[PDB]
Structure formats: C-alpha cells, structure tokens
Design an enzyme around this catalytic site. Structure first.
Site, short mmCIF file in Angstrom:
data_model
loop_
_atom_site.label_atom_id
_atom_site.label_comp_id
_atom_site.label_asym_id
_atom_site.label_seq_id
_atom_site.Cartn_x
_atom_site.Cartn_y
_atom_site.Cartn_z
N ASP D 57 -4.31 -0.66 5.98
CA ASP D 57 -3.11 0.06 5.57
C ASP D 57 -1.93 -0.91 5.57
OD1 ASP D 57 -1.46 2.07 4.77
OD2 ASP D 57 -2.00 3.46 6.37
N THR D 90 0.39 1.43 -1.12
CA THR D 90 1.67 0.84 -0.78
C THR D 90 1.72 -0.64 -1.14
OG1 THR D 90 1.96 2.45 0.99
CG2 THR D 90 3.30 0.46 1.09
N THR D 91 0.59 -1.33 -1.02
CA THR D 91 0.52 -2.74 -1.37
C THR D 91 0.91 -2.98 -2.82
OG1 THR D 91 -1.38 -2.79 0.13
CG2 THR D 91 -0.90 -4.78 -1.14
N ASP D 391 -3.11 9.72 5.54
CA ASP D 391 -2.84 9.36 4.16
C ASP D 391 -3.74 10.13 3.19
OD1 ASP D 391 -0.73 7.73 4.67
OD2 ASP D 391 -1.83 5.84 4.46
#
Lengths: 525, 202, 528, 525
Positions: D57, D90-91, D391
């Site tokens: 994450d 998110t990356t 998530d």
C-alpha cells in the site's frame, strides 16, 4: 561492499550512472555560456588573490576546485585537445555531455547501453564518410588565412584584438626558415612588455632580450652590428681537481695573483684580436654574447674597449639566433673565422621600471622574429598570450593540410540531415542512438541561439528547412539568425579538428557509459 | 589554506572546536517539543467530561485502563483529606506527638506566644493553609507549657518534624519578620521543607 | 579518493536511515542472518536435545532446551529475526512446544530459497511452488496417522502419551513424572465438555530434590493462621470475599457526641454489635473462616471466644479458585452465609513442609476444580526446568483432549513426507518443480539435528532411512544414543506426536516462508 | 539577496528549485513504481523500535519510510488525501505527477517558459476529461460486476488467494445494506483484530462480536435465545455531588446508614429483574443487559444471583450496532419502561481467546450492523490485511455508488493518448508540444505495468497503441504473456469518479510543482 573495508564508498550501477550524469550535466550547463564571439566572459581567482580572465575551457577545468572522476577525465581530455589543436575545446565537452544526456533518456527506457554504443559507432563512421566527402580544398593565400584567423580570434576573444591579431599572426607565419618544411614557433618568441596600450602589441623582426649590460658603462644604441655567439666561460673558474697556492713572501703573492687572471684575459684578447681583424675603425658594430657568465675583470677589460657584451641568455635564444643572424654558435676557442659571426642592422636599448632590454632588428632576411605583447594587466597579458597561441594553432592547422570545412553549424546540420536520411538503413534499437547521435550535433548551433537571443526551435527549423534539392552549405547568422551560406562570408574550420573531435568524444562516451560499479578503495583502516 | 594543512598535520592552533555544543543543544530543543503531545491524554482527568472535543477513537483497553488508574489515584488522594483546622493540644501529652505522630506524615510543629501581629499573622497563614492541605498535621500551642520558661524573644519558631528528626527549621521572626509576609511565601517555605510540591514566582 | 553518494533515494534518507535493496543487499543479508539464528539453537529439543542457558539483562539465569523462552528473552537488530521469533510465538499461542522444529525448518527452507534464487528463478515461481507443495502436504498429512488417542481419561494412557513430550527434559527419569502428571490431570479434568489450563497450578519448595514432590487435590498456601486453633480434621469453611472487619461505610462514617452516656456505651455498643455479628457467623455451623481483606483484632478476639480459624489471602484468582475447589462462595457482605453456599474440606492443615509454613487443603472426595502440585528441589533453575517439562506434558494433554489424532515419532513421518512430495513434484510443470522437490528435501534438516545430537553419524543413517523409506515405512527412526547406525520402530516405544502441533507448525512455517520471500526491499529508520 | 540579511538563510534559485523538486520527484517515482499493480514489489518498513509492517500500500509505504523533502512532503500529503477519499491505485497519482514533471524537464531543457506548458496541459486535460466522459460504459451493479470489480481493484495492495477469499467475504458482506439508501460507512461496520489462526480461517459475521466476557463465575457461557437490554444507566456506586457524610452515635446507626446507601442500587436492580421476569425468564428464555458504565460487585452479584447475562464497557458505536442488530430501543433512564426496548438475539455464546474472553451475538433477523473477523500469524500480516480490507470495502462502495464502470488494465489511457494526438493539431501552438508530452504522460501507466512484468517496453507499447489505433475499441494489457488483448471481457474495470479525481489532483499538483520559483528556509535566526 563495506565489509572488506568498513570505510569504502561502494556504489551500484544506477548510483554510478546517476552521479556521472549529474556531474556531466553540471559541467555542460556551466560551459554552455563560453563559446561564440558572444559567449559569457568568466573571471577566476587563484589560491593567492590573483585574478585571471578566461574564455578557455581547459583553464576553467583546471582552475575550478573540483574533485570528481568524470571531471578528471574531462580535464585530461580537454588538456590533450588544447595541447594538440587548442581551439573551440568547449565543443568537446558539449558533445560528450549532450550524448550522455541523450543516452540517458533511453537507458532509463531499459536500453542497455551497449546497443547505443554500436549505434554511436555506426553514426561515427557514416558522419566520417560524409565529412570526408564534403570537405573542400582551397589554396592557402593571405586572405584565406586572414579569414581562418578571424574565425578563431572571434572564437576566443573580442573584436579589436582579433582585428590586430589576425594581421599579426598572418605576418608571423610568413617569417619561416623553410616555406616547404614545417614551421615552428620556438623561433618566434613571445615577450611581455607591460607598459603600453592593448592596441600597442605588434611583431618585431629579430629578437629582443630582457637582460642588458651586466657591466654598465657601455653605449646606448649601435648600428650595423656583427654578432658573436659563444658558449664559453668568460668568468673566473676554479679547476675541478682541488689544489692550493703556496709561497713564502708577498712578491710571490703578487706574481701568483697576476698569473691567476691570465687564461680569461687570453680568451678576451683572442676575442679583441678577432674583432679588430674582422673590422678595424669606421665604428662598425660588433656584438659579443656569451651564454655563460662574464667576470667583472674581463667585463671591464672589454667595456673599456668599445665592444658590448651580453651574458646569461635563454638556451634556445642562441640556437634560434644561429639561424636568425646567419652566424654559427661558438662553443670554444680552438679555431675561429668571421663566418661564424652573425649580423644585424640596428641595436638599441630601452629602460622601463627596474629592467632594461636589448633590441636586435633590421635583420637582412628575417627568418626569426619576435611578437611583443604590451598591455596594462598581467592577466590581460596572459589572455593575449592565449589568444596568440590559439591564432598560431589555427593557422598551422590550416596550412599543414590543403583542405578546410565550413563551420558555424553548416556541415554540422549537413551531416545531421544525411544521417537522418541514412538511419533507415541501420538496424535495431541502436537506430535510436543514431537519432540521439544526430541530436548530438544539434547542441552546437542551438547554444549559439542561446548565445544570440532567439527561439531555439524556430531558428533550428528555419535552417533545417533551408535545405534545397542539394545540400546547402548554410550556417547560422550572428546578427539575424536567418539561414545563410558559409562561403559568402568565408568562415571555415580545419578538418582534423572535427575529426579528432569525433574520435575523442565517441571513445570517452563509450568509456563513461560502459561502467558498472564505483569504488573508493585503497583506504588502510 | 596553511591553517587547514596545519590541521591535518598538527593541532598547534585551535579553531575547529566547540561546534558540537550548540548542535546538541538544538537537537535537544527540537526533541523536547514532543512532551506536550506525549502526555496530552495522560494528564487531564476531566477528558471524559471533555467529550466532543477530545474523542477521535476509543480503544477501550488502555483508556479504560486510564480510568482505572485515575480512580485508584483519586481514591488514594481523597482518603487522606482529614485535616483543615489547626489544633491546640497541651504540653502534658507533648511527648506523645513529638514521637507518636505517624511515620510518613509531615508535622508542622508551630510554637507561639499570642499577642504580637507577627505570631498572629503567622497563625492566620497556617490556619488558612490548613484549608488547602488537609493532609498535613498542624500543631499550635503556648511554648511555655511546651517548653518550661521558653525565651519569649524566640517566637514564632517553626518546627518541621517527622519520626523525631528535625528536617527544617525556621527559628524566630528572623526569617518571618514583616507584616508584608504573605500566604504564598509561607506555602513556598513549607514546600522548600520538602513536604509540598507547588510553584511560586519568588 | 573523493566520491559522493548518488543523489536520489540515497540522498532523501535520514541520517540514521539505512537501506537494503534488490537481491544483493536485502536478500543475501536476511537469508544469512536467518541461517545464523537457526544454527544457534539447532542443538536441542530431542531425546538428547542439549539444553542451553543464557543470562538476561534483568540478571536472571535461564537454562532451557525449548527455543521459546531463550529466543523471547534474546533481542535482535535484524527484522527477519523478529519475523521468525513471532512465528515461534504464534506456534506457542497455538500449541506451545517444539519451538525448535519451526526454526530448523525455516532455516532449511531459507537455505533452499537462497539456492533457488541463485539459480535465477522469479520469486513468484519459487513461492508458488512452495505453496503448491504446502497445500499438497496439508492434504497428504492426515493420511499418515496411526493409533489415535482413545479416551484422555485412563491413567496409563496419559503416562504413555505425555511421556513422549517429556523426553525433551530429564533423560534420566521418565516414569516418575509420568505418574505425577497422569494422576494430577486425571484428577483435574472434568472429562465432560471443557477445560482450562488455569485449572491446574503447582507449588515450589526449596529443599530435597524431585524424589519428594507430590500432587494434592487441594491448594497450597504459605499463609499462617491468625487464631491459635488450627487443623480440624474435616469441617465447613466459610469464605468472605468482603474484608473481615465490620460494616464500614465506603463514605466517611463520622460520629458526633452530645452527652456522657453516649461515650459511656460507645465502645460497649461497638463491641456488642461486632459480638452479635461474629456470634451469628459462628452459629452458621462452621469453624473455618478465610477472609479476603484485613482482620479485626476485636472480631478476632470474639473468634477466639468462638474458636475460629482465620486465614487471609491476597489473590482474587485464588479466592475464586477456592470457590471452585471447595465449593466456597463469595459474599461481599458481613452477613452470615447460608448452608447451601458453604465450603467443604476433608482436611485443612496448617503444617511445615520443609521449614516453610503451609496451609494444605486435601479432600478424601478428591474433588475440586483445581489441584496443586507440590514441587521439591534445591535450586530455582531446577524448579523452572521441571515446570517446563510439566507444562509440556499438560499442554500435550490439553491439546490432545480435542484433536485426538496421533502421528508416529522418531522422524519417520518427515522422511515419508519428503519422499512422497518429491515423487509428486517430479511431475510439476513450469519451473516450480524445483521448488516443490526442495520443499520435500527440506524435511531432512530435522533428522540432521536428531542425528547430530545423539552422537551418531548423520548422513549414513539418513541414507539408510531413505533406503528403508523406499520400502514405505512411516514408523522407522533413529535409535537414541546408538553411536552406531541403527534404527527401529517408534510406535512400539510410544514415541509419537500430535497431528495439530505439526499441522500448525508447518502451516505457520510456510506462511513465514512466503512472507519473507515476498519481501523485496528493507528500510530502517534512525535507531532509537 | 535576503541571505545578506539572514546569515542562516538557505536559498535555492528558480532553476535550483526546479532541480531539487525534480530530483525529489524522480526518487519518489522510482521507489513507487515498485508498488502498484498485482506484480508490484512488497517491502519491509521497520521503525527504530523494531515495529515491522509488510505492505503493498503506497500510503503506509509513504508514512513509514524516512522522508526529508518539502516537495516530497507535499506529494505525500496529496497522495494521503487521495487515499483518504478512495484508497486505491495511490501510486498512480505520484507516478503520473513525477513523469509529467520529467517531460516538462525535457522540454524546459530548450528554454520554453513552463506556463505555456501548464495551460496546454489544462486544455488537454479538459479534452481528455470529455473523452473519458464519452468512453465510460454503464452496467447496473450485480453479482458478477461487483465481484470482478473487487477482484481487480483489490490486488493493487494485496496478493492473490487473499484477494479471492476477500472477494467472496465482501460479496457476502455488502448484502445487509438497504436496497436504495446507501447506508454504507465505516461507522457502521466493524473489523475484529484477533491473532488466533492462519489466514484460511478469516470470515465475516452479520451479527456482533464483543471482546468482553463474564464478570463473574456464575454467568452463562451460551444462550440459545436472548432478549437484549441495551442500557445507558449508571449502575456502579457514585458519590453525592455535594459531598454528604455520615454522622451518628451507634454502630447499628452505621448499619442503617449502610442500608440507606445500598437502597438505590437495590431498587434499580429490582426494577430491572422485575421487567425481566415480567416479560419472561422461564424455560431457556435468556436475558442480556448491555451497559457502557461501571457495575458494582454488589449490583453484579444481585443481578447474577439468578444467572442473568449482562456485561460492561463496550464501544460507544456498539450501541448503534446493537440497535440496528438486536432491534431493541436504547434507553438512558428507567423513568419509562416497556418491552419495546427489548432486543433479540438468536444465539449468544462465548469463546475465550488466550487471556481474552469473547462474546458473540448472531442470528439477527434484519442485521444492519455487521462485523469482520480476521485471524493471522502475527501483527504485521494482520495490519496489512486490515488495510487491504479497508481499501477493498472502499472500492466496493465506490463501485456500488454509481452504475458506470470504466475498463481497466491499460486500455483507457492509451485510448486517451491517441485521441489527444488526434486533437493535438487543434491546440493552437507550441502548447501542442506540451500536449504531446502530456499524452506521453499517460504513456507511463501500462509502461510501468510492462516494466513490472519484465517485457521489453517499446515493443509491447507500440503493439498496444497500434491495436487501439487500427480499431476503435479498448485493448488491454496481458499480464501472463504480454500479447495485447482487451481486458473488459475477463471482468476488469476501474472506478470512474476515482480516475476523475485522480486526474484532477494530478494536474493541480503538477502545475503547483512546476510553478515554483524560490525555495527558502526563512526563520530560525
């Protein structure tokens, strides 16, 4: 590997690559601003409080306090280039760093650098043949070499210095022992005479020396002088084998003292006899010069004579005067004839500050001459010395061969287009490197755009689209940026210059990009 | 230049020193800034009454544990509030409280002769102190019946005893002289005796 | 001799930040560290399993042959060490024995993993091969059982089973501890539907060695009776969870006096009230009282007048446990109890048990939810060693109450599994066959230690055991302290093991293996 | 500059500001490209205390590495806000931002003041946003849609078998929700953290599970059917708030005052048990009382003398949980009592986990509060699974919110690339240049996927772009053999509004980064 020696810098592949790229980026970006007649002017301060004004790349490399592997390689390569050719050395580092930047964008794209290396070597070969076929000859004349000198003198210095120095250099290379054999400037010295205007530097036929009458009671200006070139001891000497005097009375003291100054006096009487035999009265000039010293005794013995003597000159001074005055240097007095003598027309002395000078001019046929730099500032003197060295280097690289190529981006853009069209032939991902290799020369004109004040891509595309059906020999203008043919102004550059440029840049780029790991071993814990 | 070459070779001049002191001081200055938030939930005992401006999540494990320790602390401190009135025991019993007064309990053994505003104001201050610290044994009496024919020029003399050992002394008005003497200064002195922990300007 | 570090990741670290990347830094380093840790404690938990001792920061000595305690006290600076010790701790929370098996198996699998990554496989390929072999082992393992647990109630069966867990300690005496543990557990187990390990407690006494320890259905307390009267034969025991003193207000119970007669009968009424209360409690019919809180001297005086035994304790756990044991009941009021809520004992004796005063509870009923074990020895480390052996036996019993499946001992099962999994993995497609086969071959590390400890040659007996496993024997293993290659059966000697312990061990080991092999980079912050 | 005024002022020029920001972002993207995708690496982040967490994450990756750069700080801040809002991919955010800045670097390398690039990026963003509005496909949520959405979006931060079991568990999870109310939020669903067993044992519970067990060794360990009494009434002892005490003359007076003290807990207990019996208690009709306050041992024993079920000190949200699980009306005082407040539970028992003793309530007829149980080997794995399930439930909520699913696995962004290329000769000027790289911007997304898979980048990339250009459909990226093939047909999608917000935030932060001109450390003088 910080275990075999706990104090040792070990960097992996990407670490080495990144540090090399960063150093190259810094160096190239710093040196962008130091080319063209409109480059930025650099000031440097040594480790004493002494200032030098330079536009030279190697000076900048070896004056910066920089401790780095790639920077060291750059310093060495640019030193060699300045030694051999010594002009536009900026181009070396610009090309190397730009190729580094290019290949970065593709190695970062997973391209292992070997393939880019073969692509670059193929581009080398093809551009080599293109430059060989587009290199053009012209008989070396006065005006041709005037333009060639103007090229480098606008390259390294400003307008008026170029204006005087082009004339100076073209006259300098005229003076030569043998037109049909290589010239060498050690017979054409440079002396610094720091009391006059920057525009007062010129060329003087003959030689002028910095040391005068070590026994000053002599004349002030002599004419029609015969020259004696001797390399013999004219001062008192003690034999190498030790011995001493022995006596018992003051009469023996007088006898030994008067007999101890006999050999040197015999030598000077030989010289005086030869002088009087060569010329008696009528005030004909007769100059004797010895490489070695002269004792005050013989100094006065010859100073009461009208003869003028000079001692302790530079070793190459006599060797060049051998040719200059036409005489033959003497190394002993075992035989002698007037033939060994040289001659000159007018010799005068001039004082300044603490030192005086001996002028030898009006040579019958000047085959050795002297360049005098007169300027206020010592760093100005050194800068003018670098300028004259660059000018002589450029004129030599012009005269040595009989071929020359247009500069100012013309042949650069020409082989750019040629390689772009040829790239469809070459294979593999190395093709991409070829494109990058093409982009290599693209740095050359666009920095001029940055050195002019125009939009880079706009001028670049103007010049690239200037291409008619045939390859135009068109470069970049220095006041309008519009494409202009190189022959019309007639500014060119030497072939082997760009040749060795490509050689060095390609090989050094290969060496940089093949590396795998960086160590700082050799630390004894 | 030459100085730093000296530095590599010798230590004859000192100029590279003492540049670690301010470094460490600034390090500690930045370090000590987290103590404000380290014990934010570990000091106040009204945070439960501070709902809706103190609650983000309740893990109910260490926080109920905090209630448990807090209530133990509260019961321990409020089980000792037994005093608040300075008392007049007689000299006949005096031996029994100079010694049999409890171990671990401070005794402020006040001796006085009533009549001077010095002694009266001191008695007022200690009686008012009793209203604040009901965990301290106050003793007041007439020194004449406590000590026979005690010099009346040596009052009021403060005595601090525990387990028959004098810990603090304040003899005569030579350390209390002046009507300007006040509540907080007496509390400050008794704190300096080691019995109370509070803060005062001077 | 001047070179900086690379800008980027190496330049956004903190000063104390450290880092390991890729196969080079992170992988070789953690693999070697884990192999070191496994090899450190690779000389124990066997019939010859050689006990190792350690000194802690707290300056307490510990002589242990189960890896659990020795690793838990030991501290490390290697995160993978934290991983493996947490894996062992999870095993302990599951069963709590053989903490060396997981370490040896982890070391073997990490060695094989390093070899495979030397070969040049993707991490995913090796990981999936190991997981396939793991689930295949989970499937084949239940097919290998023999002579599962029958009752968990008879005494001889308890001896025969738990002794197997006992050989890890006290090689020179087996049957004695078997008698002790079997008697205690058969006494303590309700045998119907439930159990707690807390239902059994033990007591240590300095003095004579193991030869004089015993088991008492009835607790041991060192406390001394306040009253003179002690040790009635068999009697009723009244227990007050509330303190022994009279009703004191939890608020301030102040008193105010206006006239003389109030004072005149103040203490008279006090004494009369406590006299009435104590008299009623005595009239409840008992003679034994064990209070929770402090004891009142005047109420004690009345108890003297009523001839009552008084004991005060400290552990509320002990109080509730007594309620379980002797049928005692908690009363938070000083009110006399009812006879239904009464405690009972056939013997409550205040005695001396080695120049230490003891209150012993014993029932001819042999009843109670807790039975204590009196331990005898001369040094505290001996107490700890015997308690570890006792814990191994009793937790074996507890986990065997349910999950009555059995497994052969002597290491034959691991080699059977190795041979079978290798045979299965001979057919694996892709590049995972190497991982599946090496998973099986890893089951030779346990017999490696089992052979190096007993003073026998390892590889010779390993080859012989493979040769006889080619014949298909799940019950042939090394002879202890043979000094010469010789193997025989284990079910004959009761050398056995539990299914669930091994199952949890292998499951957790594979989980840890996949966990560590899935790690691709290590980042450390500034040290505390 | 201001450095003259503050000798302790650190100043970074505009070019220096860009250089340092770019270095920071390049480091961030290089370490982050290791994360996203089901093939991204899994790392060890360990603090000084030894706290170890193994994650895929990006956010928790950010917050347990050692960060130093203010630009990196801002990157982490915005990425954390994105993770807060949706928490997935998110990356991708930070990778996009970094490579946008990289292309801006490539172009600013030729002069080209960046504000033009910012505006061109804005226009291209607008056009691509409309393109995205067009390209998205709508299909109403169902079994297959949501199960595939979860199975796809889950693996960005967790492995495969866990993804499958989690998908099944979450399919069973979001069913106790309303039909059309959208009652889903974290306040209403709970997660159990219990280090009990392996990962093959994790499941879900429609009912409620509490960590508090019996306060007394007479309670019931299991209730077949229970009627629930949630209460918010103080049952423990309390002090009168005016500090009243006892003043008497006799010990029996003390006894009477003790009775007076106890009477209030006595009549509260009387009321409670009377209601219990009046409803019923006979014949295995269990009664449970739920209080969040203390209980005296007196009250404990008084209520437990008949074996009632009652506990203490649960989470305050558990009162909402129980109201929507048991159904009984909550209460705060016994001023008004009615069996309407009674809850119901179809099964209650206990199971003591190690030191901790657990109660479970289940068999809820209309459960509106559900809880999740996860048991793993140790702390790091359980933290990772908790983050993954958080998530994943975020993604499930995002899917079930709207009725539009965009295809995933690389098709949509190459589609945007080609469409923007088509629109490019309409952007009116050099901004097209930026727009060009802007397209190349999205170019990273499957490239990184291609990078993670080990396939050579350019070949697979041109394959994908040709596949999309020839057709009009959306072709996805293969992750087993790299051969281009559409991805929507195997059950691959991504959240529409999530990518909308992603593009929004990425563009805003990109222009904020690129518009910097001066970096200061003003203060600490």
């Amino acid at each position: 590997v910080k275990t075999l020696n706990p104090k040792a810098e070990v960097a992996r592949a990407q670490a080495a690559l990144a540090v090399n790229i960063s150093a190259a980026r810094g160096l190239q970006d710093v040196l962008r601003t130091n080319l063209g007649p409109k480059g930025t002017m650099k000031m440097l301060v040594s480790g004493a409080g002494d200032i030098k004004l330079t536009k030279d790349g190697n000076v900048l490399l070896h004056e910066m306090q920089i401790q780095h592997p790639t920077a060291s390689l750059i310093a060495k390569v640019a030193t060699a280039q300045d030694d051999i050719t010594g002009d536009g050395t900026t181009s070396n580092v610009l090309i190397i760093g730009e190729l580094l930047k290019q290949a970065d964008l593709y190695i970062s794209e997973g391209l292992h650098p070997r393939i880019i290396t073969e692509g670059f070597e193929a581009a080398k070969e093809k551009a080599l043949q293109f430059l060989e076929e587009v290199k053009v000859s012209r008989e070396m004349d006065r005006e041709t070499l005037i333009d060639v000198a103007r090229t480098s003198l606008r390259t390294k210095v400003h307008a008026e210095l170029a204006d005087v120095l082009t004339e100076a250099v073209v006259d300098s290379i005229l003076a030569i022992k043998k037109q049909d054999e290589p010239i060498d400037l050690f017979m054409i010295e440079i002396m610094e005479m720091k009391h006059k205007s920057e525009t007062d530097t010129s060329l003087i036929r003959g030689l002028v020396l910095d040391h005068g009458a070590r026994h000053p009671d002599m004349k002030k200006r002599v004419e029609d002088a015969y020259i004696l070139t001797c390399n013999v001891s004219l001062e008192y000497e003690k034999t190498e084998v030790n011995s001493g005097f022995f006596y018992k009375s003051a009469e023996e003291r007088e006898k030994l003292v008067k007999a101890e100054r006999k050999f040197i006096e015999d030598r000077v009487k030989k010289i005086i006899e030869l002088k009087r035999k060569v010329c008696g009265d009528s005030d004909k000039g007769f100059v004797v010069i010895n490489q070695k010293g002269i004792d005050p005794f013989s100094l006065d013995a010859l100073s009461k004579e009208g003869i003028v003597a000079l001692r302790r000159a530079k070793r190459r001074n006599m060797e060049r005067l051998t040719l200059a005055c036409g005489g033959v240097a003497l190394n002993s007095f075992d035989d002698l004839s007037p033939d060994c003598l040289g001659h000159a027309g007018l010799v005068y002395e001039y004082t300044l500050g603490e030192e005086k000078f001996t002028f030898i001019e009006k040579c019958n046929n000047p085959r050795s001459v002297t360049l005098l730099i007169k300027g206020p500032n010592k760093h100005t003197l050194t800068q003018i010395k670098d300028a004259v060295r660059d000018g002589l280097r450029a004129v030599k690289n012009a005269i040595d061969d009989g071929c020359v190529v247009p500069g100012a981006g013309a042949v650069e853009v020409a082989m750019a287009e040629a390689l772009i069209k040829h790239k469809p032939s070459v294979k593999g991902r190395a093709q991409l490197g070829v494109q990058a290799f093409a982009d290599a020369l693209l740095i050359i004109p666009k920095v001029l755009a940055q050195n002019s004040g125009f939009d880079l891509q706009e001028t670049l595309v103007k010049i690239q689209a200037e291409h008619s059906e045939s390859g135009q020999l068109v470069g970049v203008d220095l006041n309008t940026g519009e494409p202009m043919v190189a022959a019309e102004v007639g500014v060119w550059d030497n072939y082997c210059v760009k040749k060795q440029l490509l050689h060095s840049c390609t090989v050094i780029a290969t060496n940089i990009l093949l590396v795998d790991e960086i160590m700082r071993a050799g630390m004894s814990s | 230049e030459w100085n730093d070459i000296l530095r590599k070779k010798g230590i004859l001049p000192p100029k590279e020193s003492l540049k670690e002191l301010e470094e460490e001081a600034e390090e500690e200055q930045r370090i000590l800034q987290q103590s404000v938030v380290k014990t934010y939930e570990d000091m106040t005992l009204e945070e439960l009454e501070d709902h809706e401006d103190e609650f983000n999540e309740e893990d109910e494990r260490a926080i109920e544990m905090y209630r448990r320790r807090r209530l133990a602390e509260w019961k321990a401190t409020k089980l000792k509030n037994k005093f608040g009135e300075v008392l007049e025991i007689s000299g006949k019993d005096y031996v029994q409280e100079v010694t049999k007064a409890g171990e671990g309990l401070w005794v402020i053994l006040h001796l006085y002769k009533q009549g001077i505003p010095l002694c009266a104001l001191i008695n007022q201050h200690l009686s008012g102190l009793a209203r604040k610290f009901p965990d301290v044994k106050f003793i007041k009496a007439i020194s004449t019946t406590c000590i026979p024919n005690y010099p009346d020029r040596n009052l009021p003399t403060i005595f601090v005893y525990l387990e028959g050992d004098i810990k603090a002394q304040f003899i005569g008005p030579l350390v209390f002289g002046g009507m300007n003497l006040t509540r907080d200064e007496l509390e400050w002195k008794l704190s300096e005796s080691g019995a109370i922990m509070t803060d005062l300007e001077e | 001799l001047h070179v900086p570090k690379a800008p980027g990741f190496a330049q956004m670290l903190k000063e104390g930040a450290k880092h390991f990347s890729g196969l080079e830094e992170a992988v070789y380093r953690n693999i070697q560290a884990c192999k070191e840790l496994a090899q450190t404690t690779r000389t124990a938990y066997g019939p010859n399993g050689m006990n190792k001792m350690v000194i802690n920061h707290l300056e307490k000595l510990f002589v242990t042959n189960d890896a659990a305690t020795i690793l838990r006290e030991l501290e490390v600076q290697h995160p993978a060490a934290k991983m493996i010790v947490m894996a062992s701790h999870m095993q302990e929370q599951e069963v709590g024995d053989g903490t060396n098996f997981v370490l040896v198996f982890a070391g073997a699998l990490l060695e094989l993993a390093e070899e495979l990554l030397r070969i040049g496989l993707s991490v995913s390929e090796v990981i999936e091969g190991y997981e396939i072999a793991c689930r295949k082992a989970h499937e084949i393992l239940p097919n290998l059982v023999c002579c599962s647990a029958k009752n968990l109630r008879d005494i001889d069966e308890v001896s025969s089973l738990l002794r197997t867990s006992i050989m890890s300690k006290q090689y020179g005496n087996e049957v004695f501890l078997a008698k002790l543990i079997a008697q205690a557990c058969v006494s303590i187990f309700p045998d119907s539907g439930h159990f707690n390990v807390d239902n059994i407690r033990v007591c240590k006494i300095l003095g004579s060695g193991i030869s004089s320890s015993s088991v008492l259905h009835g607790m041991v307390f060192k406390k001394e009776t306040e009253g003179d009267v002690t040790s009635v034969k068999d009697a009723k025991i009244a227990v007050y969870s509330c303190p022994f003193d009279g009703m004191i207000t939890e608020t301030k119970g102040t008193v105010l006096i206006k006239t003389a007669e109030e004072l005149m009968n103040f203490s008279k009424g006090e004494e009369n009230l406590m006299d009435a209360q104590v008299k009623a409690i005595a009239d409840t019919g008992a003679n034994v009282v064990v209070t929770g809180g402090k004891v009142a001297d005047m109420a004690l005086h009345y108890a003297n007048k009523y001839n009552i035994m008084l004991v005060r304790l400290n552990s509320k756990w002990d109080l509730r446990r007594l309620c379980k044991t002797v049928g005692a009941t908690a009363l938070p009021r000083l009110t006399p109890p009812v006879l239904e809520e009464m405690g009972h004992c056939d013997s409550v004796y205040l005695s001396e048990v080695g120049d230490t005063q003891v209150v012993v509870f014993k029932h001819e009923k042999e009843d109670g939810a807790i039975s204590t074990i009196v331990l005898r020895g001369s040094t505290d480390n001996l107490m700890d060693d015997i308690e570890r052996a006792v814990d191994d036996g009793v937790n074996t019993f507890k986990v065997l109450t349910r999950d009555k499946r059995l497994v052969p001992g002597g290491g034959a099962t691991e080699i059977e599994l190795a041979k079978q999994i290798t045979s299965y993995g001979e057919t694996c497609p892709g590049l995972e066959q190497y991982a599946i086969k090496k998973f099986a071959e890893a089951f030779e590390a346990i017999p490696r230690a089992l052979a190096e400890n007993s003073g026998v040659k390892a590889n010779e007996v390993i080859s012989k055991l493979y040769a006889v496993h080619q014949e298909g024997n799940k019950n042939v293993g090394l002879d202890i302290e043979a000094e010469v290659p010789a193997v025989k059966d284990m079910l004959e000697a009761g050398i056995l093991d539990t299914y669930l312990g091994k199952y949890w061990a292998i499951k957790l080991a594979t989980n840890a293996a996949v966990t560590v092999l899935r790690v691709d980079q290590i980042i450390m912050a500034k040290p505390a």
